[PDB]
Design a protein around this nucleic acid. Structure first.
Ligand SMILES: [Mg+2]
Ligand SMILES: [Mg+2]
Ligand SMILES: [Mg+2]
Ligand SMILES: [Mg+2]
Ligand SMILES: [Mg+2]
Ligand SMILES: [Mg+2]
Ligand SMILES: [Mg+2]
Ligand SMILES: [Mg+2]
Lengths: 25, 206, 97, 121, 96, 87, 81, 217, 129
RNA sequence: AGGGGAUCGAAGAUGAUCAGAUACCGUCGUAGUCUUAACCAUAAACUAUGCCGACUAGGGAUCGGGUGGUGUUUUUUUAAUGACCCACUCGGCACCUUACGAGAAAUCAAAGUCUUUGGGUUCUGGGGGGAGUAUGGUCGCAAGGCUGAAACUUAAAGGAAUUG
């Protein structure tokens, strides 16, 4: 797992975690 | 300390000027500046020949102080000095080494060319660098025929002279032999010139 | 570890130089790091000169030459054997021939 | 296919070293003399050693061979080495000296037959 | 001056720098956070008591191959569940 | 050095470099000792009578031995006008 | 060289050195009396002037400022000090 | 028996040189362990480590064994020897020879007052090899060798009674640690102290005095 | 910028001594430097030294006898009581018998032994051995 | 958000290749590439080398400024000036040799003047993961940035070099 792609994947999980939280809010 | 009849006699200066021993390199390195009596137009640096004569006489006193003449060793890998070192060998004790130095001559006590000298005279600190390097391993003082550009690493006595001319190299080795013999029971009287001339020390083609 | 003191390029005092395009593959290359060669060719050949001297007006007119500076990326220069990978001591040698 | 091993080359080298006067340019007598001056366990090895000795003698007839030193060539080595010219090359042929060298000798305070010359810039 | 300040009047800087950087140590961090009292099965104590909930056979990590015979225990003072190894040949029979 | 009541206790007192006054260690194999024969009237060697200098391996490895030896030999009268203090 | 007289260096060495880097630093500049084409009035000119120095008779120019020493105005004579 | 091949061994065999301190004083290179055997008969050795080193090959790993050897009389001399060989016994024998050939003096001194014989070092010394730095500090009488067992044994073979040791770096690298200690004790006669400031007449080497029976023809 | 003229001076002497020079130039020659050099001179660690008078701060040429192992500064100039001089000597000096820790006291700049027998204390300037 | 939008060209289309190819290759192609007015504040933003000061070795080249040669060169024949040559000097981008010294080494004139440990000063690190994650705060239109844990897990991870 390349480091910048793991960073990109983690930005995708973070970007959707901050959407489910806003939804559940 | 010297009486001195050991001053540069005008006939010896005559030989040194005729051998071009005063014509030095165009790039003096910083440990060889004391031996410079000004540059020439067109770049050649003049060596102070009187300082060459004093250093040579000091070198011969160091050679004469060695108890066994056969453990005085003289090195010349350059052809311009090979005959000169051989003639120095024939006239003094002077175990000669002309040509390849065979790494391990001063170390490696099992080599056939293994010597354990008390003093080493080299024609060229650049070309005979292996012998100088090996001398620094086993506590051997070094005299060297140095030009103004030749390195002075592990060289204790430097004779400032032209390193390029075969007449210069042959003359310095011949003068060193003559002065060494003069400083012992071999050239009993110092005034009269030596019977043999500086030419038989010069390299010859082919 | 570090392979070269001049990292792979010729840039000590810039930060940014400019890109150039590889003549073989169009790769973008800092101009100082690009492998540069000067192809000076006869406009015809090393063998058709006699033919063109026989079959042309203006006896031995000019024999014009073609000049072009080629820029190579590291990969294309190695694969085309322009720079020929070297030993540790021999890569420190900057002489052309 | 005919490269000689060091055992042949060294044996022939030593033979020339200590038996050059006894040797010749003829293989037949060279092998007949290898029988008496050396102990070789094989006739074929003796033939090779005498053949390479004859080869090196043929080479020795035209200039010295490097690494091989015998009395008959060393004696003429010092005979040629003791050559001494009739007149010096460091004696005066008529002493050309320039300005800085003249200042050198006069700083030394030696009176010599100098001759100051000018060099083009 | 190899980094750190050396003035005779730089005591505040040096003591604060040391305070800041002691948080990089495991033991200092744990003690000052009180993690043993807060986040630990034993509340910072050397021993604890519990009730055996069930016997477990734990498969040991490679390259070993064994069943390690632990028990699930519920601690009396916390209610937390822990797994405890039962050390010896047998001795799981003694635990029940 | 020497204990309470005298008795020099030194395995040995090492030589010191005649140029830098550094101790010449037992393993300093690049250090040299140079003997210059003293000369009587009409230029004779007088064997066994030398003006002696010691040079550290450091000075020789720095290319300074020739200059240092010029200064010491001139200070001892062996040389006349080779070395100069000012430069 | 490892032994040298730092208190008494050669005048050639000192003249070679930078002005700030001699044993005691000092100026390599000087002052000149300059005689103009017109009159024989003495005016003192700094070597590295920076001023287009003029006189009373030839009230235009004696020296032209440069990046270093000023250049005299091609019709004057001068003496140091 | 032993027939010398060097001038120094020739003189030591002839008895013209009777102490190894002359060899130290004149910095004479030693190239024959018979010189050390003759001049220091009471020299005891100890093997301090035998660890294998391997060289990867087309077919498996070639193994040799490297022996570290320390020699020394407890009265001011030690030598260090490192040798790798096919057999442990061979590496040990050649390590003993190298250790004897490297024998150096050490300068023992007083921690405080000069009562009695020297019992410690005369100066703080350090040595470095690889990452390992070994620092030796003079210690008061009765302190003993405050050092790890390997350095302690080397100092015991040296003759130091009281010393403090401080170490930095990967001291578990034993050969580096012993080399660092060997350097630090060797530096004891390098360090110039005010009681060594006095000028000395600069003696003449026996290589010159007995040049007659040296360099045999 | 220059923060300790004495640190610069003692560095210059150290780097000259380590390379084998018989002399060294020092700029700009405070009087604390002068007193420090005089304490080294009275114990034989240097030779004769010269103050060159330029009209700004002077320079010093120091002659070196080859007997200095190390001269150093202790910055900051720590306050030293009578009873913690010996811990400075233990930390800094190679042996108890030789070597000097230089202090500055209201009784003057001096070595630690003169400080011991005058029973005075102050700040630490440096060390020499 | 305007303008511009030749070119190349995340997306997309399409032709191939291949087991597959939603990749490399081919042809197009929106955004973008450019500009104006605002945002953002991040890069292997690297010399992976904080800044200021001092000292320790030799060399030649080079850029900018200066100083000095009864030094060349063109312009009237040479004045000058320019350009060039030589010798110095300050400042700068670098380079070469050597290893004093340093380093684990690679290597390094600083990465030297360090257990013989202190010139001034700022920032940062403390085994590998979890994790630059979660949480709170703050900035931002957004993308995101700055600040930033723990529970838990683990005997290694890693650096440089050697032989294969
Ligand atoms: Mg790589
Ligand atoms: Mg950049
Ligand atoms: Mg700080
Ligand atoms: Mg960043
Ligand atoms: Mg960074
Ligand atoms: Mg620049
Ligand atoms: Mg930690
Ligand atoms: Mg960590």
């Amino acid at each position: 797992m390349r480091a910048k792609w793991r960073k990109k994947r983690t930005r995708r999980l973070k970007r959707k975690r901050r959407k489910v939280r806003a939804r559940s809010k | 300390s010297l009486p001195a009849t050991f001053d540069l006699t005008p006939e010896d200066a005559q030989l040194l000027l005729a051998a071009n021993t005063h014509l030095g390199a165009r790039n003096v390195q910083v440990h060889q500046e004391p031996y410079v009596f000004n540059a020439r137009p067109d770049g050649v640096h003049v060596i102070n020949v009187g300082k060459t004569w004093e250093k040579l006489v000091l070198a011969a006193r160091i050679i004469a102080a060695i108890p066994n003449p056969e453990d005085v060793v003289a090195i010349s890998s350059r052809t311009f000095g090979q005959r000169a070192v051989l003639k120095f060998a024939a006239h003094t004790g002077a175990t000669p080494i002309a040509g390849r130095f065979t790494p391990g001559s001063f170390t490696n006590y099992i080599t056939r060319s293994f010597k354990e000298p008390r003093l080493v005279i080299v024609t060229d600190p650049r070309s005979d660098a292996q012998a100088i390097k090996e001398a620094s391993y086993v506590n051997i003082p070094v005299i060297a025929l140095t030009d103004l550009d030749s390195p002075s690493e592990f060289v204790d006595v430097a004779i400032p002279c032209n390193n390029r001319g075969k007449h210069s190299i042959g003359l310095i080795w011949y003068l060193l032999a003559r002065e060494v013999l003069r400083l012992r029971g071999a050239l009993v009287d110092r005034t009269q010139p030596w019977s043999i001339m500086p030419d038989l020390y010069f390299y010859r083609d082919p | 570890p570090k392979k070269r003191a001049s990292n792979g390029r010729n840039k000590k005092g810039r930060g940014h130089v400019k890109p150039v395009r590889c003549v073989n593959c169009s790769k973008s290359i800092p101009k100082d790091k690009a492998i540069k060669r000067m192809a000076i060719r006869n406009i015809v050949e090393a063998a058709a000169v006699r033919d063109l001297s026989e079959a042309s007006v203006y006896p031995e007119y000019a024999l014009p030459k073609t000049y072009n500076k080629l820029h190579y990326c590291v990969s294309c220069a190695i694969h085309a054997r322009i720079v020929r990978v070297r030993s540790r001591e021999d890569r420190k040698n900057r002489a052309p021939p | 296919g005919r490269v000689r091993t060091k055992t042949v080359k060294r044996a022939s080298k030593a033979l020339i070293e200590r038996y050059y006067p006894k040797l010749t340019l003829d293989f037949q007598t060279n092998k007949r003399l290898c029988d008496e001056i050396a102990t070789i366990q094989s006739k074929r090895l003796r033939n090779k050693i005498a053949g390479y000795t004859t080869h090196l003698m043929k080479r020795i007839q035209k200039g010295p061979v490097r690494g091989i030193s015998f009395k008959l060539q060393e004696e003429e080595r010092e005979r040629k080495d003791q050559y001494v010219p009739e007149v010096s090359a460091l004696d005066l042929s008529r002493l050309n000296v320039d300005n800085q060298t003249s200042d050198l000798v006069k700083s030394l305070g030696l009176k010599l037959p100098l001759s100051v010359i000018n060099v083009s810039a | 001056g190899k980094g750190k300040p050396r003035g005779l009047n730089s005591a505040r800087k040096l003591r604060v720098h040391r305070r800041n950087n002691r948080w990089a140590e495991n033991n200092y961090k744990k003690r000052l956070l009180g993690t043993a009292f807060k986040s630990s099965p034993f509340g910072g104590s050397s021993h604890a008591k519990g009730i055996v909930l069930e016997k477990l056979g734990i498969e040991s990590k490679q390259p070993n191959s064994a069943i390690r015979k632990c028990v699930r225990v519920q601690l009396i003072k916390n209610g937390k569940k822990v797994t405890a190894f039962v050390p010896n040949d047998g001795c799981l029979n003694f635990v029940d | 050095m020497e204990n309470d009541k005298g008795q020099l206790v030194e395995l040995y007192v090492p030589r010191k470099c005649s140029a830098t006054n550094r101790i010449i260690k037992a393993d300093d194999h690049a250090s040299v000792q140079i003997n210059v024969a003293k000369v009587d009237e009409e230029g004779r060697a007088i064997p066994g009578e030398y003006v002696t200098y010691a040079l550290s391996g450091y000075v020789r490895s720095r290319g300074e031995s020739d200059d240092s030896l010029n200064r010491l030999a001139q200070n001892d009268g062996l040389l006349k006008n080779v070395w100069s203090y000012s430069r | 060289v490892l032994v040298q007289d730092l208190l008494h260096p050669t005048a050639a060495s000192e003249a070679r050195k930078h002005k700030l880097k001699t044993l005691v630093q000092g100026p390599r500049s000087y002052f000149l009396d300059v005689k103009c084409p017109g009159c024989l009035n003495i005016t003192t000119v700094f070597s590295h002037a920076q001023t287009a120095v003029t006189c009373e008779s030839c009230s235009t120019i004696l020296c032209t400022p440069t990046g270093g020493k000023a250049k005299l105005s091609e019709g004057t004579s001068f003496r140091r000090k | 028996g032993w027939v010398p091949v060097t001038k120094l061994g020739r003189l030591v065999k002839a008895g013209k040189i009777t102490t190894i301190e002359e060899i130290f004083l004149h910095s004479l290179p030693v190239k024959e362990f018979q010189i050390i055997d003759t001049l220091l008969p009471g020299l005891q050795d100890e093997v301090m480590n035998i660890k294998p080193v391997q060289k990867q090959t087309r077919a498996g790993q070639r193994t040799r064994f490297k022996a570290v050897v320390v020699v020394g009389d407890s009265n001011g001399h030690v030598g260090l020897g490192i040798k790798t060989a096919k057999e442990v016994a061979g590496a040990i024998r050649a390590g003993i020879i190298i250790a004897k050939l490297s024998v150096i003096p050490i300068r023992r001194g007083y921690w405080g007052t000069n009562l009695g014989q020297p019992h410690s070092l005369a100066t703080k010394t350090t040595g470095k090899c690889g990452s390992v730095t070994v620092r030796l500090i003079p210690a008061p009488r009765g302190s003993g060798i405050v050092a790890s067992p390997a350095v302690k044994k080397l100092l015991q073979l040296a003759g130091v009674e009281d010393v403090y040791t401080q170490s930095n770096g990967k001291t578990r690298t034993l050969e580096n640690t012993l080399k660092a200690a060997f350097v630090a004790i060797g530096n004891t006669y390098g360090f110039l102290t005010p009681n060594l400031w006095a000028e000395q007449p600069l003696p003449v080497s026996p290589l010159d005095i007995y040049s007659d029976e040296a360099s045999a023809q | 910028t220059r923060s300790s003229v004495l640190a610069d001076a003692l560095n210059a002497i150290n780097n000259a001594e380590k390379t084998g020079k018989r002399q060294v130039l020092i700029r700009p020659s405070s009087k604390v430097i002068i007193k420090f050099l005089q304490v080294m001179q009275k114990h034989g660690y240097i030779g004769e030294f010269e103050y060159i008078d330029d009209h700004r701060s002077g320079k010093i040429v120091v002659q070196l006898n080859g007997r200095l192992n190390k001269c150093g500064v202790i910055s900051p100039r720590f306050n030293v009581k009578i009873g913690d001089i010996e811990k400075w000597t233990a930390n800094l000096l190679p042996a108890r018998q030789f070597g000097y820790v230089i202090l500055t006291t209201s009784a003057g700049i001096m070595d630690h032994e003169e400080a011991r027998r005058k029973h005075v204390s102050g700040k630490i300037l440096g060390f020499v051995y």
